[PDB]
Amino acid sequence: RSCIDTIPKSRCTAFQCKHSMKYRLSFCRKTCGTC
């Protein structure tokens, strides 16, 4: 019950938040604002 990225934050690029549902929902939830 924590909101974290599960890969290094730097990989959670603007491009991936924009275009990758996988990154938004699984790898980059904190950086892409989905938690």
UniProtKB/Swiss-Prot annotation:
Effect the entry attributes to changing residue 20 to Q/R: More than 25-fold decrease in potency of inhibition of Kv1.3/KCNA3
Result for mutant: residue 20 to A: 20-fold decrease in potency of inhibition of Kv1.3/KCNA3, and 80-fold decrease in potency of inhibition of KCa3.1/KCNN4
Keyword NAD among record annotations: no
Positions of the ShKT domain: 3-35
GO CC, alphabetical: extracellular region; nematocyst
Location relative to the cell: Secreted; Nematocyst
Lineage top rank: taxon: Eukaryota
InterPro entries: ShKT_dom
Residues under site feature: Important residue for binding Kv1.3/KCNA3: 7, 9, 11, 20-21, 23, 27
Any further remark recorded for this protein: Negative results: does not show or very weak activity on Kv1.5/KCNA5, Kv3.1/KCNC1, and Kv3.4/KCNC4 (IC(50)>100 nM). The synthetic analog ShK-192 has a paraphosphono-Phe (Ppa) at position 0, a Norleucine at position 21, and is amidated. It is stable at acidic pH values and high temperatures. The circulating half-life of the synthetic mutant is estimated to be about 30 minutes in rats. However, low concentrations of functionally active peptide are detected in the blood 72 hours after the injection.
Record's function text: Peptide with both antimicrobial and neurotoxin activities. Inhibits voltage-dependent potassium channels. Potently blocks Kv1.1/KCNA1 (IC(50)=6.7-87 pM) and Kv1.3/KCNA3 (IC(50)=10-250 pM). Less potently blocks Kv1.4/KCNA4 (IC(50)=0.31 nM), and Kv1.6/KCNA6 (IC(50)=0.16 nM). Shows moderate activity on Kv1.2/KCNA2 (IC(50)=9 nM), Kv1.7/KCNA7 (IC(50)=11.5 nM), and KCa3.1/KCNN4 (Kd=0.03-30 nM). Blocks Kv channels by binding to a shallow vestibule at the outer entrance to the ion conduction pathway and occluding the entrance to the pore.
Name of this protein: Kappa-stichotoxin-She3a
Biological source species: Stichodactyla helianthus (Sun anemone)
